[PDB]
RNA sequence: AUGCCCCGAAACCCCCGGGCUACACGCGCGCUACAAUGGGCGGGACAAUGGGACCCGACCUCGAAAGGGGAAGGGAAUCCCCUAAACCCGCCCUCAGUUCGGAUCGCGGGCUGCAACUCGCCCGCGUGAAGCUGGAAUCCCUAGUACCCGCGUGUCAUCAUCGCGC
């Protein structure tokens, strides 16, 4: 009873995996993080502005 | 196709779009001359940067220039006669080709209605559609008062060109006529200094009150 | 003939035929068209020479549509309720039904039949400033 | 006749081309025919993101762009010489994948 | 001889041999092309270099990439190199200089990028 | 009498499911197609035992999808329109028509003074 | 001569006129009274607009060589007003290609290449490139230039 | 990350019905409708950013159709999304709240998901609102730029007329 259902598809499915938010997640090519947290960890990732 | 393919092969001796070539056409007022570019082309249509230059657009064709003005009249500040002018079906905006088969319709008109060479009305039409003196703002002490100006010829043709614009959508909007069929009324109005037209009325209103501003 | 009654409702001869069709409240463009078709008849022509054979070949067309070779999705409604057969309703005909479909909806007091009853939108639009 | 089609790819292009050195340097040495590296379309991974961590601000986004590199080496076979592909430094970043053709 | 035009995205590949004066755009004829303007614009270096040359020669023409007027346009600056690279003549280049400045240069403008806050209707659009 | 695509409501009653899926709209026989979930199945359980009378009890539901369908002409059942299990007695018209329909969630709106 | 070397509307126009008498071709009985596209507002106006259609796919056949339903149907395809919310783009119908195509390959114009598409038969390339040379006899006695 | 305070079968957690979409209304921003440039049939010059594995899905075949059975190729210059859109013409319609425009209803079909009436859209059918150029006043761009026209994709089964960027 102290489950939470099994969803696949919808918000609820999708979390980040680091701070654990329900929101933003983009999933280009399969990060699994917040938008805002995506800045954090940018210039770890390879990532550059330009 | 063939009056296509006809129009096509005709202005192989060089002719602006079709035919009328333009040596046979001529400038009458002596201020014109040095900025209507008559030059022989076959299309009105360079893509040019004139605007960069600060005086480059002298040696942009005028039915170029022309069509300049066409294209980019609709939904503005002006109500003249509280109307609002706008072209919401298939706007003449980036569609220059549009505007080209438009003004080609309009010169095949003043050909089959004056029968002359249709650059030589439109020179009669800009020489007596151009406003010749304005009203100036000045301050001083902060007395605000108004002053009589003279205009350079630049600015005439933008406003005389302008004033056909604003013709012919004046009269195409709201109404069962057709854009080129206005245009050549604006321009052949215009041409024999016909006050009905409002180009030549609107110099006139602009010579006027500058005249009595002095 | 400037004036041209069918199926009890006016329409003027100018206009062309699926045109003139089109001031019937019961036919509309392409059912005047695919109608017109069916009678073997262009419907471009003007509406000023129907004769009376063709005006009742159209007028029975509309009491028969499905079979006078039209498919069954192109009537209005479709699977009839008090009868389960597709037919197209004409005039008074559609207003009644859709009488009683206005009173069926208010009597099992669906959201639709309230929304009915208020003059008020059904299919979820929003009414804070539109309206 | 048989052809060993490398593809190696990297972020950084200095690996990618330190790489494509040592291969040609070895198919030189070992007098093997090597088509040269081609340098394949890079791929370029954009992703836009609003700046503003919260509902209040002006729209402002910062768009960050991923270029990552790839080129073609098409050798012919040769036992002796694929045999000193497996011994190369290879740079982390640098993938390499090596396979045949008729 | 080989000749290359660039016109924005437009990109036009010329190949000009002897010949009766078959002119081909695409594989297609120059007079059949619908938009006239178009036709306008391809037909103008070969209208200003001349019926001679216009006959003497065949160019085969490839365009690809952009819109019709810039295919158009490519095309133009194709048959103008074409044309110039054939005969070697410094006259034919200085007329077509006074036509116009680009029938040896060409157009080196480019699109620019769409810039946030309603980026949609163009780079230079902003919001009320 | 009472009728549904030319057909009265005994006529509906001997009809099996399939049929009787057939005579329903596009939505509401796709829905029957695609199955019905286990809360749904138990709780037409149910009903059946009441319309028998095994099942005494005041019967009650949530499921706002529940299409009703013949069989179910003639009884009442209390679905949850938000607080509580608003009562509904099922009519032979009541046929074709999902329950949610019938409980008032939202509430009248009407106009006070404005501020 | 080719297709290639002749404009594509009055070659269509002359195919068309052409395999109108041919008995192969036929629009069926749903043809009249459904329109030629999904996004397509009203219904057809000229009851010959069927065989423009085959005139047309056939001569798409002679240009790609294999070809299907589906990137036919976005071919065809067209901008359609959605009211309020704006134009957009939509795939044209197609049953009406599936059935002329049909009759095409029937007609021994067009094959099949299955897991390809529909390929164009060495008699359709003569059909067409013999109505294409007679369109270019044409067009070089009224432009002469079309003998280059 | 966290100063401080507060609840501890609760100020905890789980499950579900509804709400977050409710209206006499005020305001902002985008989308469209306010035609003869025009609506409809047919031909043709055309890209591009990126994406695709329960996916791109070409393609055979059936069904108007949304789609179903089968099915090649594809984890990225290899296959698909793939068509751009703007445009012109061979032709039709003839200045009208209408052949504009579809809101608004009811019908019957399609996709998704446990399920969409609160709470998706689309496919076709009778139906056709207001709107036919809008005051004081009013915001912003200035050369591939304003104007104007569309494609694609992020998030994502659907929902955005949105944002992004081509």
């Given at each position: 009873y ?18 654990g ?29 330009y | ?23 046979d ?7 014109l ?14 893509h ?20 300049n ?15 609002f ?12 080709v ?5 003004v ?8 089959q ?39 350079s ?5 933008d ?14 909007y ?21 006050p ?19 | 003939?400037?004036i041209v ?5 006016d ?23 695919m ?66 479909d ?30 | ?6 593809k ?63 080129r ?31 | ?20 004066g ?31 040359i ?17 295919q158009?346009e490519?095309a ?26 680009t ?26 | ?7 009265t ?6 009809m099996?499911?399939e ?35 095994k ?17 179910m ?43 | ?31 009249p009274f ?62 009406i ?31 067409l ?9 044409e ?10």
């Open positions: 102290n489950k939470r259902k099994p969803r696949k598809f919808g918000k609820g499915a999708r979390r980040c995996i680091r701070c938010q329900y929101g933003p997640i983009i999933r280009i090519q399969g990060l699994m993080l917040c938008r805002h947290c995506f800045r954090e960890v940018a210039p770890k990732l390879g990532f550059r502005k | 196709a063939k009056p296509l393919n006809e129009r096509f092969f005709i202005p192989h001796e060089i002719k602006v779009m079709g035919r009328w070539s333009t040596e056409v001529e400038v009458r007022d002596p201020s001359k040095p900025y209507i570019n008559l030059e022989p082309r076959l299309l009105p249509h360079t040019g940067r004139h605007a960069k230059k600060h005086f480059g657009k002298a040696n942009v064709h005028i039915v170029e220039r022309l069509i003005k066409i294209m980019r009249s609709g939904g503005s500040h002006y109500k003249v006669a509280g109307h002018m706008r072209r919401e079906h298939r706007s003449l905006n980036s569609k220059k549009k505007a080209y088969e438009v080609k319709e309009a010169f095949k008109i003043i050909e209605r004056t029968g002359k060479n249709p650059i030589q009305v439109l020179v009669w039409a800009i020489e007596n559609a151009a406003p010749r003196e304005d009203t100036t703002s000045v301050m001083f002490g902060g007395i605000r008062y108004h002053v009589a100006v003279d205009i010829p630049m600015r005439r043709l406003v005389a060109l302008r004033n056909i614009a604003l013709g012919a959508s004046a009269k195409c709201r109404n069962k006529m057709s854009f080129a069929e206005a245009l050549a009324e604006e321009i052949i109005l215009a041409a024999n200094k016909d009905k037209s409002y180009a030549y009325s609107k110099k006139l209103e602009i010579e006027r009150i500058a005249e009595s501003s002095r | 003939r400037h009654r069918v199926a009890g409702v329409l003027d001869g100018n206009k062309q035929l699926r045109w003139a069709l089109t001031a019937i409240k019961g036919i509309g463009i392409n059912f005047a068209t109608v017109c078709r069916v009678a073997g008849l262009d419907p471009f022509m003007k509406a000023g020479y129907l004769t009376d054979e063709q005006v009742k070949k159209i007028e029975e067309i509309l009491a028969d549509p499905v079979a006078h070779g039209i498919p069954r999705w192109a009537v209005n409604r479709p699977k009839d309720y008090e009868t389960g057969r597709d037919l197209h309703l004409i005039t008074a005909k559609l207003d009644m039904a859709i009488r009683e206005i009173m069926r909806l208010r009597r099992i007091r669906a959201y639709r039949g309230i929304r009915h009853e208020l003059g008020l939108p059904v299919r979820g639009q929003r009414t804070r400033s539109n309206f | 006749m048989q052809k060993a089609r490398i190696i790819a990297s972020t950084n292009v200095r690996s990618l081309d330190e790489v494509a050195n040592q291969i040609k340097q070895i198919a030189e040495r070992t007098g093997v025919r090597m088509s040269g590296p081609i340098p394949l379309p890079t791929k370029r991974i954009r992703i836009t993101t609003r700046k503003s961590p919260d509902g209040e601000g002006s729209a402002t986004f910062d768009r960050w762009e991923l270029r990552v590199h790839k073609l080496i098409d050798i012919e076979a040769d036992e002796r010489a694929m045999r000193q592909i497996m011994r190369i430094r290879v740079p982390e970043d640098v993938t390499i994948e090596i396979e045949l053709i008729s | 001889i080989q000749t290359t035009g660039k016109r924005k995205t437009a990109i036009a590949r010329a190949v000009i041999r002897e010949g009766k078959r002119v081909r755009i695409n594989g297609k004829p120059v007079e059949i092309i619908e938009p006239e303007i178009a036709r306008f614009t391809i037909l103008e270096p070969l209208i200003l270099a001349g019926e001679e216009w006959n003497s020669v065949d160019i085969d023409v490839k365009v690809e990439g952009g819109g019709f007027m810039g158009a490519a133009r600056m194709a048959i103008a190199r074409a044309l110039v690279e054939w005969t070697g003549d410094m006259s034919l280049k200085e007329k077509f200089m006074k036509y116009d400045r029938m040896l240069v060409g157009d080196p403008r480019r699109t620019e990028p769409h810039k946030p806050n309603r980026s949609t209707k163009g780079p230079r659009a902003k919001r009320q | 009498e009472f009728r549904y695509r030319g057909y409501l005994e006529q509906l009653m001997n099996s499911l049929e009787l899926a057939r005579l329903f709209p596009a939505r509401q026989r796709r829905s029957l197609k695609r199955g019905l979930t286990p809360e749904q199945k138990k709780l037409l359980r149910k009903i059946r035992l009441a319309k028998k009378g099942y005494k009890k005041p019967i009650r539901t949530h499921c706002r999808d529940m299409i009703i369908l013949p069989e002409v003639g009884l009442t059942i209390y679905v949850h329109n938000g607080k509580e299990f608003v009562p509904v007695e099922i009519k032979p018209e009541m046929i074709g028509h999902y329950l949610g329909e019938f409980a008032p969630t939202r509430k009248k709106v009407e106009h006070g003074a404005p501020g | 001569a080719t297709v290639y070397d002749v404009p594509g509307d009055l070659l269509v126009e002359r195919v068309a006129q052409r395999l109108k008498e041919i008995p192969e071709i036929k629009p069926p009985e749903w043809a459904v329109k030629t596209g999904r996004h397509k507002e009203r219904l057809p106006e000229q009851e010959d607009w069927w065989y423009y259609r085959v005139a047309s796919i056939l001569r798409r056949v002679y240009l790609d060589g294999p070809v299907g339903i589906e990137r036919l149907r976005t071919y065809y395809g067209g901008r359609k007003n959605r009211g309020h919310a704006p134009e957009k783009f939509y795939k044209a119908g197609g049953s290609i599936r059935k002329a195509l049909q009759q095409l390959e029937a007609a021994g114009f067009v094959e099949k290449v299955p897991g390809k598409g529909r390929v164009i038969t060495p008699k359709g390339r003569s059909f490139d013999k109505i294409a040379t007679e369109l270019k006899k067009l070089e006695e009224i432009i002469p230039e079309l003998k280059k």
